[PDB]
Amino acid sequence: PIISLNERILEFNKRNITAIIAEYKRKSPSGLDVERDPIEYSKFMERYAVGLSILTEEKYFNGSYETLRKIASSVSIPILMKDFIVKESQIDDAYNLGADTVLLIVKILTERELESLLEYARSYGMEPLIEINDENDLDIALRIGARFIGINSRDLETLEINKENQRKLISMIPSNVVKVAESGISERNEIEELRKLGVNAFLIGSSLMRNPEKIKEFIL
């Protein structure tokens, strides 16, 4: 069932180990196309990662519901179907596939849809990672009572990485919400930095698909 990605993140926080959410994306609107083995990668990362973020987004991220399905089988660490969740059914697929949580992007969702999509995620026992980009997504995640927020430094619409803005939000986020700082994390230097800023987990992907061995240096 649902192995809270956030709880593990919480245990990693107590455990002092860098809670990093490893992403698996062969294709991406940002990075280059790097085909790897879904199982080799997941296998190598379940040995270190706090969880895996998997992109079942076929078009722009070249990922499948089967990839997610297979990855979830192969590992005993939390999984996050990272898609563009807009319908409660995706939560179902998500759940029935192997997700232990799902990605909700405040941008593309009305406050109503996000609020319910959250409610329906919790009905399944999962705590969706709610991704925010600005002062306005933050205030909504907050307004719907989010407990697991994801501050994306990378803008969907533009692909621009405002780390400055990213950290602002992190400052405006209550110390009870598990914060996952996504995008842009390149070094263990910034990790321990954001980590001082309260972020509990880090969603990395492209660097890890490039050279997964890299996570070994992040976890220090």
CA 90 and chain centroid, separation? 16
Residues 179 and 201 sit within 8 Å (Cβ to Cβ): yes
Catalytic residue among 4, 6, 153, 183: 183
Catalytic residue among 23, 46, 57, 127: 23
Give the separation between CA 52 and CA 205, rounded to whole angstroms.
9
- Please classify residue 81 by burial: count the beta carbons closer than 10 Å to its beta carbon, then call 0-12 exposed, 13-18 middle and 19+ buried: buried
- Distances from the Cα of 217 to the Cαs of 88, 163, 200, in angstroms? 38, 21, 17
Q: What is the CA radius of gyration of the chain?
A: 15
Residue type, 152: N
183 is catalytic: yes
179 is catalytic: no
| Length reported for the chain | 220
**Header resolution in angstroms:** 2.8
- Please classify residue 147 by burial: count the beta carbons closer than 10 Å to its beta carbon, then call 0-12 exposed, 13-18 middle and 19+ buried: middle
Q: Which domains does the chain have, with CATH numbers?
A: 1-220 (3.20.20.70)
Catalytic residue among 4, 25, 42, 57: 25
182 is catalytic: yes
The tokens describing 116, both together, are: 């319910």
The tokens describing 43, both together, are: 């296998």
Give the separation between CA 218 and CA 204, rounded to whole angstroms.
10
Give the separation between CA 126 and CA 137, rounded to whole angstroms.
21
Catalytic residue among 133, 152, 153, 200: 152
Catalytic residue among 46, 57, 127, 131: 131
Return the closest-CA partner of residue 103 out of 56, 37, 70, 159: 56
Contacts of 36 (CB under 8 A, 6+ apart): 24, 26, 209, 212
Per-residue H/E/C for the chain: CCCCHHHHHHHHHHHCCCEEEEEECCCCCCCCCCCCCHHHHHHHHCCCCCEEEECCCHHHHCCCHHHHHHHHHHCCCCEEECCCCCCHHHHHHHHHHCCCCEEEECCCCCHHHHHHHHHHHHHCCCCCEEEECCHHHHHHHHHCCCCEEEEECECCCCCCECHHHHHHHHHCCCCCCEEEEECCCCCHHHHHHHCCCCCCEEEECHHHHHCHHHHHHHCC
163 is catalytic: no
Residues 36 and 43 sit within 8 Å (Cβ to Cβ): no
Residue type, 175: S
Torsion-angle region of 21 (φ positive above 0: left; ψ -120 to 50: alpha; else: beta):
beta
- Please classify residue 32 by burial: count the beta carbons closer than 10 Å to its beta carbon, then call 0-12 exposed, 13-18 middle and 19+ buried: exposed
152 is catalytic: yes
